[PDB]
């Protein structure tokens, strides 16, 4: 914002926010996979117990 007009800089900040959002999505997908694996392991442990 500090150096350019709004009309053009808003496109760049939209690019940045989209990239950050996609990175967050990737993180959450990895978390889902890990949680599913951990749930399987927890069920196995419950059966063991």
């Amino acid at each position: 914002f500090s150096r350019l007009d709004k009309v053009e800089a808003e496109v760049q900040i939209d690019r940045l926010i989209t990239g950050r959002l996609q990175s967050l999505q990737t993180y959450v997908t990895q978390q889902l996979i890990r949680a599913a694996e951990i749930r399987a392991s927890a069920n196995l442990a419950a059966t063991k117990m």
Binding site: E10, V11, D14, T18
Partner: protein, 48 residues
């Protein structure tokens, strides 16, 4: 006794209700999610 025990409360059938609610909620989110602009002029193609 089990017959009346099933219908006495309402949380006994939680899992199947959760499944169907999850499916419906996913569908509704998907159909509503197309109203966004994604930093464009409008969400309707024909006017664009």
């Amino acid at each position: 006794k089990i017959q009346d025990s099933l219908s006495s409360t309402a949380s006994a059938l939680g899992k199947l209700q959760d499944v169907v609610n999850h499916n419906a909620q996913a569908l509704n989110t998907l159909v509503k999610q197309l109203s966004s602009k994604f930093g464009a002029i409008s969400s309707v193609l024909n006017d664009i």
